[PDB]
Amino acid sequence: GSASQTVTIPCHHIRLGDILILQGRPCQVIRISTSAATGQHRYLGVDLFTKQLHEESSFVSNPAPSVVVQTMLGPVFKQYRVLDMQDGSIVAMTETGDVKQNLPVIDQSSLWNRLQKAFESGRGSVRVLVVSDHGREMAVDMKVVHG
Template sequence: MADDDFTSGDAGASLTIPQQCSALRKNGFVMLKGRPCKIVEMSTSKTGKHGHAKVHLTGLDIFTQKKYEDICPSTHNMDVPAVTRKEYQIVDLTEGFLSLMDDSGVIREDLKLPEGDLGKEIDKKFTDGEPFMVSVLSAVGVEHVIGLKTTNA
């Protein structure tokens, strides 16, 4: 008992929750091959000789849009990621990192400018001085800027 370390810990909230495979729905979220995915297609096979109907899931990674597939017996549990989306106002853009402010005025500077067309569009709008918000999606401890919304301020 003397060598237990209680100096740090968390509330025990899990990054995923188990859910029965048959309860999953299209446009919902599920972990496929260890990645948080949005279900884009699912089909259920009939009960076979060994008793379980199988569910065939196809999902797109919510951050990379890469396609993943999996087959699971309908009675088994699959992990469902806790996905949150939050809007931030852009305050600054320095060396590829965004300074973002939430509704309560808290500023965070830990998110990178996304790559590709979205990153170019954010950079252009910021340089032109246009008011806009960015959407940040977070799941399983990962956060990414996934979109922007023009505001009329």
């Protein structure tokens, strides 16, 4: 794994708790403040893998006249099926049938417990949302597909 795919988010749609790419790292935002000198917004986040703190200021662009936008980068989440769960890791499958045997689950907002209860009442409708960071994947949220 080299880099990863990113989406561009306008700063007015970013709130505490969102997941941003802060200096190449997937992070959960815990502070938002504003530079008095430049007006850029400044984002303090926790690294999802290493749990270290990082900060990054926003990018200001002038695409059209009278159009000023500030943006940050967000990660593209992948969506895997859950084939099972064994001691803090899961067996997942991608949309093309590629099996991942020991995919880890982050410890955040008791995701393991919500995932387990959803798995035991509807295996086929549960999905994990997965973040990639330089070859390493981790499940960071869950989702139940209706059909």
